[PDB]
Enzyme design. Structure first.
Site, mmCIF file in Angstrom:
data_model
loop_
_atom_site.group_PDB
_atom_site.id
_atom_site.type_symbol
_atom_site.label_atom_id
_atom_site.label_comp_id
_atom_site.label_asym_id
_atom_site.label_seq_id
_atom_site.Cartn_x
_atom_site.Cartn_y
_atom_site.Cartn_z
ATOM 1 N N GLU B 288 10.283 -4.782 0.828
ATOM 2 C CA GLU B 288 9.140 -3.909 1.049
ATOM 3 C C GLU B 288 8.305 -4.770 1.994
ATOM 4 O OE1 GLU B 288 11.454 -1.565 -0.691
ATOM 5 O OE2 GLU B 288 9.466 -0.733 -0.336
ATOM 6 N N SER B 323 -1.186 -1.527 2.319
ATOM 7 C CA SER B 323 -1.678 -0.146 2.328
ATOM 8 C C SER B 323 -3.005 0.052 3.060
ATOM 9 C CB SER B 323 -1.877 0.322 0.890
ATOM 10 O OG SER B 323 -2.850 -0.505 0.266
ATOM 11 N N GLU B 417 0.812 -5.285 12.553
ATOM 12 C CA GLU B 417 0.048 -5.521 11.335
ATOM 13 C C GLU B 417 -0.788 -6.792 11.446
ATOM 14 O OE1 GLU B 417 0.987 -5.061 6.600
ATOM 15 O OE2 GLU B 417 2.105 -6.594 7.701
HETATM 16 N N1 LIG Z 1 5.448 -3.198 1.061
HETATM 17 C C1 LIG Z 1 4.715 -3.688 0.068
HETATM 18 O O1 LIG Z 1 4.678 -3.184 -1.062
HETATM 19 C C2 LIG Z 1 3.888 -4.918 0.321
HETATM 20 C C3 LIG Z 1 2.965 -5.325 -0.643
HETATM 21 C C4 LIG Z 1 2.222 -6.487 -0.432
HETATM 22 C C5 LIG Z 1 2.384 -7.197 0.726
HETATM 23 N N2 LIG Z 1 3.247 -6.753 1.668
HETATM 24 C C6 LIG Z 1 3.381 -7.462 2.978
HETATM 25 O O2 LIG Z 1 3.465 -8.825 2.743
HETATM 26 C C7 LIG Z 1 2.884 -9.546 3.866
HETATM 27 C C8 LIG Z 1 1.863 -10.520 3.340
HETATM 28 O O3 LIG Z 1 2.505 -11.449 2.422
HETATM 29 P P1 LIG Z 1 2.931 -12.914 2.928
HETATM 30 O O4 LIG Z 1 2.023 -13.422 3.995
HETATM 31 O O5 LIG Z 1 3.168 -13.718 1.701
HETATM 32 O O6 LIG Z 1 4.355 -12.613 3.576
HETATM 33 P P2 LIG Z 1 5.559 -13.545 4.099
HETATM 34 O O7 LIG Z 1 6.675 -12.716 4.590
HETATM 35 O O8 LIG Z 1 5.024 -14.504 5.106
HETATM 36 O O9 LIG Z 1 6.048 -14.347 2.809
HETATM 37 C C9 LIG Z 1 6.493 -13.606 1.646
HETATM 38 C C10 LIG Z 1 7.239 -14.544 0.721
HETATM 39 O O10 LIG Z 1 8.446 -14.950 1.418
HETATM 40 C C11 LIG Z 1 8.572 -16.337 1.429
HETATM 41 N N3 LIG Z 1 9.269 -16.672 2.683
HETATM 42 C C12 LIG Z 1 8.773 -16.998 3.920
HETATM 43 N N4 LIG Z 1 9.686 -17.227 4.826
HETATM 44 C C13 LIG Z 1 10.873 -17.041 4.148
HETATM 45 C C14 LIG Z 1 12.252 -17.121 4.535
HETATM 46 N N5 LIG Z 1 12.663 -17.435 5.767
HETATM 47 N N6 LIG Z 1 13.207 -16.864 3.580
HETATM 48 C C15 LIG Z 1 12.824 -16.540 2.317
HETATM 49 N N7 LIG Z 1 11.563 -16.431 1.840
HETATM 50 C C16 LIG Z 1 10.637 -16.693 2.816
HETATM 51 C C17 LIG Z 1 7.131 -16.866 1.297
HETATM 52 O O11 LIG Z 1 7.094 -18.207 0.887
HETATM 53 C C18 LIG Z 1 6.538 -15.854 0.275
HETATM 54 O O12 LIG Z 1 6.990 -16.162 -1.048
HETATM 55 C C19 LIG Z 1 2.303 -8.471 4.811
HETATM 56 O O13 LIG Z 1 3.242 -8.089 5.807
HETATM 57 C C20 LIG Z 1 2.133 -7.286 3.843
HETATM 58 O O14 LIG Z 1 2.044 -6.011 4.437
HETATM 59 C C21 LIG Z 1 3.998 -5.651 1.491
#
Ligand SMILES: NC(=O)c1ccc[n+]([C@@H]2O[C@H](COP(=O)([O-])OP(=O)(O)OC[C@H]3O[C@@H](n4cnc5c(N)ncnc54)[C@H](O)[C@@H]3O)[C@@H](O)[C@H]2O)c1
Ligand SMILES: NC(=O)c1ccc[n+]([C@@H]2O[C@H](COP(=O)([O-])OP(=O)(O)OC[C@H]3O[C@@H](n4cnc5c(N)ncnc54)[C@H](O)[C@@H]3O)[C@@H](O)[C@H]2O)c1
Ligand SMILES: NC(=O)c1ccc[n+]([C@@H]2O[C@H](COP(=O)([O-])OP(=O)(O)OC[C@H]3O[C@@H](n4cnc5c(N)ncnc54)[C@H](O)[C@@H]3O)[C@@H](O)[C@H]2O)c1
Ligand SMILES: [Cl-]
Ligand SMILES: [Cl-]
Ligand SMILES: [Cl-]
EC number: 1.2.1.88
Lengths: 516, 516, 516
Positions: B288, B323, B417
């Site tokens: 997601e 959202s 975003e």
């Molecule tokens: N669709 C949804 O329901 C939903 C809900 C909340 C947040 N989000 C999205 O999440 C983002 C914000 O969260 P963020 O900054 O933590 O996101 P991110 O993608 O930077 O990191 C998410 C998670 O992935 C890990 N990660 C980072 N690089 C990785 C890799 N190469 N392999 C595996 N894991 C890795 C991080 O350490 C963290 O635990 C925004 O894009 C937001 O829209 C989506």
């Protein structure tokens, strides 16, 4: 609730004179039709091409059953354009209307069943009953999915209410996708993989297996006659690694429904995980691959019943089934009794031209023949050959029922899918070891257990890790609705065909709230 | 059926003296514990490591709110061993027993909600109500999934009967998987992604976001007290590209449950499609990702209601929501009236230390501050800055509510975003164009429409292509059970959280037949 | 299933300071608008006319509370054209969309309930609680019918399947019809009779009673803001014998929904049975007429409880209710005890300007005053006047609570609907005679029994022939959903309002079969 409850289409045994007469006439007409050319079907019309696909009679390969046009990238693009254009309106059809269209198609297919069966006999070498079972399953998919689709109609989702608001969740189709089918059940699987997605509002570009392009065309004649709107279903016979791969990797293909070999399935699943240039979604890929299915027999089993079920499971349609018993695991007490009975029954099996309704027809092609014979040579250096193991005389691709015994569990013939009339017998100490050996392969599609001991059956129900398990009966012939079909591990993504859950795979959910 | 019907946990408004007193007490308790170190949680025990992870207060980054152990490949392997060992028996627990365990965890979380809220305030900069909503949603996921899981209990599949046979189809869990969570809803999403799979028999290795490792540890304190068997849930704080990627690519990881950025989601989905050396299954990956959510307002809307909903949607939790309304699409008749009201409301928003319950706290980190400020610079070259667009005084990462007008639909700030308090206003001719602009992005998560015209609302219900659509209300704050949450297109795989369908994603089906 | 389960709107008691303050504010706002003119509402727009209708304050008839346009044949024709044009598309709206429109209207009405209540106080002389009950019932009709309509959605009919065919039966709306309403419940009944037919796809031309044209106009302001498509609902205030009769007799009016006097109901039912020149259907006419409702009290009853319920039932809204207790049947053992208590309670009732919230306001008009006073004169010649029977001082139409005793069952005041604060007391020997007297009238709307004897209550349940029977409680105030409302005999056609069955009256069924 507007039609009779679903019932499976009866499989013809041809024991009555009426049935035999009808089948003989159907076979004669199809044979007299050898050489016919079938074009592609794109956007509601038959479209021919310069190049062609040739379909040979595996029982007599010098005979051309028919030819079809050959789809290349240009044809794939035209089909994509037509499918997406059609999706725009097809997705908005009331579900009741889409389901009635499927029911019409099923009625038309039922009226042409003998012809379709006869085409299978000549094009892929199925004997009469195997052909009848194939077409019956196709009719079942249409009848079943037509009804199952109504269970997802607007607005189908159960949600929790909230004060002062209307909260409505419902399903919507994905878009245009590609169906890539196998040659072993070219009517049933081809039909099911197409109509399931289409029933709920998706549109499809269907790529039949090279060895079964003619019968695929006949299925499309039925779709055309039924009246599916232009672009909803498209027929693109062609080379898998060419047009098939082109569509799988295309940024505008929404989903991929595939049934075939593990080798190809792995490539498709990997490609589906990539974001093609300009792609705006995460592709869904459903891949149902092969299996290395075993039947376990312990000392408490009805040995005669077991031997019969093993022979049917191992040699039906020459072992060219993803569900075929290619491994026979016998506990010490069942080894001699069961093996002797299996050998006695197997040596009486007739092999010959499919039109003669033999126990076994030919394998599907020269390449399949080469592969099966190659595995037999490998088997001779791994286990002990005790029956068959040779190509029979004749132009057709006839291979004799083969049995290897004292086969090591990790031998290539006990691990790799041969997809031919080759059974590997493995001797184990007890039931626990039988389950260990049964589970120790990369696959998990079908499996069986012949035993009278309740504790062993219930033990297997929990621990024999296959998607379709059968007790005291053959492990092939899963019936739509009765036995949701699909495996575990490298046998696929567990997309259960002939089950309510199948359609959910081709839908996404939308949640809409209005605060009054 | 053995517990009260599901109801959403009320979100505290802190309008009473007792509520405010309770929060002040929780805030004091939490900050008094800023020096705490939280180890990893593997196989039922807290295990420390040499290296550590530091968590800072975004409202005062020179202040450490806690430290945790740091998981590397060795710890990931230990967690894998524990998770698979636990799966062997956890999968056989009666569903009623697993559901009761979840209910116990929910009860424990509810008793510690002020503590968790206070931790969110200090660790990720959420104001009071945003923190309460987060924890309430987490409790909701546990309560909802505990009940939903029972709907899949043995034997749950509806099948067609067959003469002389028992045909039973049922669901079984997949195995051990990895959960990779975001920092914006570190209690709610972290909890939901873990307990959903666990409820139906899977085991999980949870990798919290670097910016929210402390609150993640507190959630595990609850899991530990609840009594989940050793190995069922494991806590592995660490670097995403290190331990996260290691698990995603591992041949022994059965599924991946991810919520985060599109950039990372794309890599995970691609990796999941590959067969790692020795892997014996097709990995399931649920991702997601982000969104570029728009609210459309036409000339028939209640402009004051619209302006309020827009401000709440765009600036709640500083716009750090998947959202969040980051686009405001106004038809010509609604442009001036709505824009004027939005600016007037937005200019009155307070920004400061989260613990003082301002309208906006700080963005989560120096990196996020850098990204948002960079997008603001990009915006100055694409649209017209009319409000905010500046960093505010203080060590904390305070950014003023920002508004850009006359933004081209294809502009970077109208497509990418930003995940910050930045709203892009787009002027369109009519409702048709409003929908065209709304749909023209690679995303499809949330969307909203403020209008009194029934025809426009029902039109959007069918054509505004987002997974969660809201009419005449804010587009953030989806409630578990009420609004299945998940998007379309590059917003993800449409794994609807807080819905019955969610649990099906973590199950496979087995069909067992016995011929009597 | 997408909204909370139906619950009745609470009736305000004005026991709190806030409630009283809110009402005073509403009363002030309404009287400040006494000079307003309300046009007709046709085809989505307010259309004025040359002539007008004047509405007076029954508590001070020299005071005008508002004026409205006056519809004639030309306007009726324009409304017909608009209603049929709208029907063409409104009938095709998904039921979910039509139901959401109703829910929006209910939300808007709820937000303006104090205003509507105040309008009822001034226009028809209802005291505070009577006004609140009226508006609450209107909201209930909208909420109830919005939900009930979904129970008839496509395809709702349960049919028997047939081999090789799809057999689908479903409901479709009738077309454009006329609603002719009374002045006693000008918000509730007016609203219910309109929205029920409209909810399932019909369109309506509404003719409010002359004495309640202003509040009817305010209800249409709500329909307009809600967004009903042009022509779906039309407002035609005018003279019953003129525009009302014109529509009833029109060949292009599909159905008639009427609530009013028996005299008028008889004429309407007769006219509906005739085929007007060029008419192409059999008109449906639903007429709910008056009643001569009795409350029976035997010697086993709680006399104090009975007396209170009798006074409430007889004098609520000055006895201007189709459900009002106008007959009190007392067995010999209950006669003196109950009569004494009834007289003591009745003599303490206050009568005066409705806005001061007296027990009784004025009767609705000079004509009603004339009728009630005339019946009082008739009563003096049939029974014994023991309380009231006089006009009270003031311009307003104030009539004192009246009681006649020793009234012969066949007396005019014991048979004819007076529709005023006049109670006729009849003495009978036993319960059997009480039931005989209760049933011996041309009506059969409401009835009540106060008794502790189970056998008498269950006897009445079977033999007291009224559509709405109540035991040990008031016989007025039927609640939507709880008590389907409608009578027997000359009380009407038994069209049960506030019940699932009501909507069926405005639908016809189609059966479509397809042979595959
Ligand atoms: N669709 C949804 O329901 C939903 C809900 C909340 C947040 N989000 C999205 O999440 C983002 C914000 O969260 P963020 O900054 O933590 O996101 P991110 O993608 O930077 O990191 C998410 C998670 O992935 C890990 N990660 C980072 N690089 C990785 C890799 N190469 N392999 C595996 N894991 C890795 C991080 O350490 C963290 O635990 C925004 O894009 C937001 O829209 C989506
Ligand atoms: N799991 C099941 O339900 C099921 C059922 C029937 C058959 N099978 C399996 O199918 C196999 C037999 O069928 P087959 O020989 O046609 O299999 P195959 O994998 O060789 O070909 C399947 C289809 O894929 C196409 N194809 C080939 N290479 C491709 C590529 N690179 N990209 C895209 N498409 C490509 C082919 O043209 C054909 O249409 C066996 O492994 C059998 O077990 C599985
Ligand atoms: N059964 C019920 O549910 C119910 C409920 C409330 C009131 N009522 C009855 O309604 C009556 C009080 O209401 P009212 O005084 O308005 O009744 P009414 O019959 O005098 O008038 C009712 C409506 O019919 C119109 N009308 C009058 N003559 C007409 C004609 N010839 N053709 C067409 N329309 C004509 C009026 O203008 C008004 O809109 C009492 O008898 C009371 O019992 C019945
Ligand atoms: Cl299993
Ligand atoms: Cl959509
Ligand atoms: Cl009765």
């Amino acid at each position: 609730m507007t039609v009779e409850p679903f019932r499976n289409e009866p499989i013809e045994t041809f024991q009555t004179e009426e049935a035999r007469r009808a089948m003989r006439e159907a076979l004669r007409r199809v044979r007299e039709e050898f050489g016919r050319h079938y074009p592609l079907y794109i956007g509601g019309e038959w479209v021919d091409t310069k190049e062609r696909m040739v379909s040979l009679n595996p029982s007599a390969p010098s005979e051309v059953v028919g030819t079809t046009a050959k789809a290349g990238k240009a044809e794939a693009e035209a089909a994509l354009e037509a499918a997406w254009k059609a999706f725009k309106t097809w997705k908005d059809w009331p579900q009741e209307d889409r389901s009635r269209l499927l029911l019409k198609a099923a009625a038309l297919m039922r009226r042409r069943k003998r012809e379709l069966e006869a085409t299978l006999v000549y094009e892929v070498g199925k004997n009469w009953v195997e052909a009848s079972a194939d077409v019956a399953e196709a009719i079942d998919f249409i009848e079943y999915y037509a009804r199952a689709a109504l269970r997802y109609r607007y607005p189908a989702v159960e949600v929790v209410p909230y004060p002062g608001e209307d909260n409505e969740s419902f399903y919507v189709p994905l878009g245009a996708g590609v169906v890539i089918a196998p040659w072993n059940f070219p009517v049933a699987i081809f039909t099911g993989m197409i109509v399931g997605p289409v029933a709920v509002g998706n549109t499809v570009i269907a790529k039949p297996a090279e060895d079964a392009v003619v019968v695929g065309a006949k299925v499309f004649e039925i779709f055309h006659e039924a009246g599916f709107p232009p672009g909803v279903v498209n027929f693109l016979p062609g080379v898998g690694e060419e047009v098939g791969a082109y569509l799988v990797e295309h940024p505008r293909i929404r989903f991929i429904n595939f049934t075939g070999s593990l080798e190809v399935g792995l490539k498709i699943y990997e490609a589906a995980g990539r974001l093609a240039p300009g792609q705006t979604w995460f592709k869904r890929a459903y891949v149902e691959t092969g299996g290395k299915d075993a039947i376990i027999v312990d000392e408490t089993a009805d040995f005669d019943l077991a031997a019969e079920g093993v022979v049917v499971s191992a040699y039906g349609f020459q072992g060219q089934k993803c569900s075929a018993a290619s491994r026979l695991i016998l506990t010490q007490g069942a080894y001699e009794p069961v093996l002797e009975r299996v050998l006695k029954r197997a040596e009486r099996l007739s092999v010959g031209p499919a039109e003669e309704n033999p126990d076994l027809g030919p394998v599907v092609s020269a390449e399949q023949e080469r592969k099966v014979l190659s595995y037999i040579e490998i088997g001779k250096n791994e286990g002990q050959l005790v029956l068959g193991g040779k190509r029979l005389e004749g132009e057709g691709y006839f291979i004799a029922p083969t049995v290897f015994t004292e086969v090591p569990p990790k031998a290539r013939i006990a691990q790799e899918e041969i997809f031919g009339p080759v059974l590997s017998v493995i001797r184990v100490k007890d039931f626990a070891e039988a389950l260990e050996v049964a589970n120790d392969t990369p696959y998990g599609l079908t499996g069986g257990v012949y035993s009278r001991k309740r504790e062993h059956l219930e033990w297997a129900r929990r621990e024999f890790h296959v998607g379709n398990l059968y007790f005291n009966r053959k492990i092939t012939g899963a019936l739509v609705g009765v036995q949701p079909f699909g495996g575990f591990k490298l046998s696929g993504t567990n997309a259960k065909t002939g089950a309510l859950d199948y359609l959910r795979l081709f839908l996404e959910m939308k949640a809409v709230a209005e605060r009054f």
